[PDB]
């Protein structure tokens, strides 16, 4: 019936396990595309796994570092870690590469890309709210925390590369923001303004509309450069 | 009348906003002199701003990292962040470059350099005292914390460079300490000895004399290689 | 009489000062062998000392970083820091290089290598137990913490190099684990399984047998490539 009331259901969909799985699948597919990633999975499987955990848990790691909490606090969520580990294992080692083939099938891939954005927006909003809880007027801390929750491993890409034995210092995601990093920055500003009560919208409505924006943008981009 | 009583007034001058402004002006001028900095402000203004915040808040960031606190805790001081942001904006984007011209005028520049040293010494002493509060006999933690409060962004210079897309690993400020880094190390030893009660001087008198030493050294150096 | 009762004495030998000294001696000998280390001790003695502290306190530094504690918390143990500092000073600056000559004498060196492994295993077990205390079911945090307590400075080797002015990003200890790093990973899994109560052995017996394994392996390796 009511929109802000469908918005409430949208903004509270349980992200574990299905939306988290989609987030992991899309993120580990991106890892498998990186130069040298398949050979690394064969010669250095622990590091390859460590790399997938970053792609999977980089948002949490970086937010925890910014706020002074254990950077591996999120790895206490055993079920999530094991689910991400299963995704890594299936994408790199499934017989016949069958799992890769199924999740890369473009209609399926686009649904996972859409689901990944649901998770990303929830993470941005959670970062703003968690920072606000610790710093009620900490606008810059709220923005920084929402930003790294959204952007994830991209903001640590120089060190994800280092882990892989790669060093490209000429560029980084702050000096040259990719679209998801820039979108996450706009998103964190919006959620911080909503948290400040200067943006006159319900949090659920902001989640709904910003998620739809990210879904449309990301699905379009995936479908176009396929 | 009494010196240790003028020393008390000296050591308690309110550093916000005027001495902090001078600290920011001198530090962002240094940023503007770094290779590529003006072009970065035009092509990557967020990163340029991020870079100025490091120059501005590197002391706090590093001390917080050493002590296990949020490395962005200091960014909860909204007024300070906004003041530093105004300084960055004026130095890089003022029409006619007028702000740069005024603050670079050598007599004005030297006064800001003097004021910057007032802030630096207060920060060193505060780092020793804050570490002492957490570790009453933690001599090495007191020295480490006073040192990074004094030295600031210089000790993270390899990563300030990385942010700018620059990587010079051959050298760093520990392997080859510049004068302010070395002076900050001597300063942190003195304040730690004062805190230990092995150096028989009042804290205010130590602040006065060490600040005068840094002012004389820094103003001489600025005026000479102008 | 009883083995698990000799195991109790073995697992509770006071590591300070003698086993810690051996740990420091072996670790700083390794530092002195690294390219450029002697010249660095003459031209950059503070950084050389800073480097020895990493070799000495890297386990604690990294575990503290992983758990969100002060990375220099361990430097509050003044006696340990001063003992490590004496070892650094004697190894690099003793007249006639006499201390180096004595501790490098192969029978003496092998005893110190054995003693170093006693300390390493105790550190792994302590890391698992300390992580368990904070996260009763935090299996991945327990493994990560035991691993860096065992592996020590090796896992930060890229940044130990950076401190020395060296940058080799092609390789790292996760992508290509050395034997002690890999052994520490196996060790942390065993202690975590013991902590979980899935490995039916007393903690003291596990300490005894895993320490004997590391002693045999490390003494063999030192004696062979001497
Ligand atoms: Br790459
Ligand atoms: Br491996
Ligand atoms: Br979240
Ligand atoms: Br969060
Ligand atoms: Br408050
Ligand atoms: Br992405
Ligand atoms: Br530079
Ligand atoms: Br930008
Ligand atoms: Br301060
Ligand atoms: Br402080
Ligand atoms: Br105490
Ligand atoms: Br300076
Ligand atoms: Br090397
Ligand atoms: Br030195
Ligand atoms: Br320990
Ligand atoms: Br520990
Ligand atoms: Br619990
Ligand atoms: Br070793
Ligand atoms: Ca902390």
Curated annotation (Swiss-Prot), chains A, B, C:
Cytoplasmic domain ranges by topology: 32-45, 98-101, 157-177
Binding site for a 1,2-diacyl-sn-glycero-3-phospho-(1D-myo-inositol-4,5-bisphosphate): 116, 120
Membrane topology listed for this record: Multi-pass membrane protein
Top-level taxon of origin: Eukaryota
Swiss-Prot/TrEMBL keywords: Ion channel, Ion transport, Membrane, Nucleus, Potassium, Potassium channel, Potassium transport, Sarcoplasmic reticulum, Transmembrane, Transmembrane helix, Transport
Subunit composition and interactions: Homotrimer; conformation seems to be controled by binding to diacylglycerol (DAG).
The protein's name: Trimeric intracellular cation channel type A
Species: Gallus gallus (Chicken)
Upper lineage: Eukaryota, Metazoa, Chordata, Craniata, Vertebrata
From-to range in the entire protein, with total length: 7 to 232 of 296
